Amino acid sequence: ESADLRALAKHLYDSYIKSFPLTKAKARAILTKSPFVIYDMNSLMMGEDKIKEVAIRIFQGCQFRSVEAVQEITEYAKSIPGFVNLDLNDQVTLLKYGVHEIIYTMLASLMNKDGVLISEGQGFMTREFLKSLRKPFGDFMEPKFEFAVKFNALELDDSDLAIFIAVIILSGDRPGLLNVKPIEDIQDNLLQALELQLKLNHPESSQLFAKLLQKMTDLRQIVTEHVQLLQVIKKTETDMSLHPLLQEIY
């Protein structure tokens, strides 16, 4: 029956709002109290005032905020009906891989073709400034921006993304999973949830479900580059430290 899921879709929006303070809705407003834009070396030196080299400072900046994003997605995951009940060793597995795919989804919410929100929306930072960095980091965030723009085209809601965020973490198709059946069953309901939500919220985006499920192809492909790229920067610069929570995931 519908109300089964309609109400499940509600439970998850409400947790979504309660777990991530920068929503797609809040970003879209501040991308159309305006952000301080950074598009040059010095505008970064203002960015300190207003809100080791730059490419390394700015990389370590992506890392702190991601340690706090991983915090946010754990909080959200606990909320998902079933997840807390599952095997403990697999909870840790689902997050270990389920995190990054979530990140570059929420990322897209903060992105347009031109750049990316920063410091909780306080600032903006160009897609072309980023390209113009130090040899390893001049390619740090480029495919993100590419996928951001194709992914954002579906023009998803927050309420949509909350169920899709759910489906992601509860994969089953993940490496190291002892009990796969109960994961895959939670997801059968989340997919069932998601299906009706895309019909109702976006009644024109025909095969939006299909076209959304399709973007999990793009998403892993992104994670793969980030991993081996992230793996380089350790060899280039063993001076750099990583946060242990980020270590675990990686």
Ligand X SMILES: O=C(O)c1c(Sc2ccccc2)c2cc(Cl)ccc2n1Cc1ccc(Cl)cc1
Ligand Y SMILES: O=C(Nc1ccccc1)c1cc([N+](=O)[O-])ccc1Cl
- 11 is annotated as contributing to ligand binding: no
> Can you tell me whether residue 196 is helix, strand or coil?
helix
For 201-237, give one letter per residue: b (16+ CB within 10 A) or e.
ebeebeebbeebbebeeebeebeeebeeebeebeeee
Residue type for 234, please? K
Is 143 a binding residue for ligand X by CB under 6 A? The answer is: no
Site for ligand X in 24-63 (CB under 6 A): 47, 51, 57-58, 61-62
Interaction of residue 247 with its own copies, rule CB under 8 A = yes
Contact 82, 179 (CB under 8 A): no
**Is 226 annotated as contributing to ligand binding?**
yes
Q: Min. distance of Cβ 228 from ligand X in angstroms?
A: 17
| Binding of residue 159 to ligand X (CB under 6 A) | no
Interacting residues with ligand Y (CB under 6 A): 59, 62-63, 66, 100, 103-104, 107, 226, 230, 250
User: How far apart are alpha carbons 132 and 233 in whole angstroms?
Assistant: 17
Place of tokens 């689902």: 94
Between 213 and 242, name the residue whose CB sits nearer to its own copies. Answer: 242
Residue 222 CA to residue 245 CA, distance in Å, equals 21
* Contacts of its own copies in 27-86 (CB under 8 A): 64, 67-68, 70-71, 74-75, 78-79, 81, 84-85
Q: Is 167 exposed, middle or buried (0-12, 13-18, 19+ CB in 10 A)?
A: buried
- Stretch of residues binding ligand X (CB under 6 A), selected from 3-11, 27-35, 64-72, 196-204: 64-72
Per CB under 8 A, contacts with its own copies among 152-191 are none
Task: By CB under 6 A, name the binding residues for ligand X.
Answer: 47, 51, 57-58, 61-62, 65-66, 69, 103, 107, 110, 116, 118-120, 123, 141
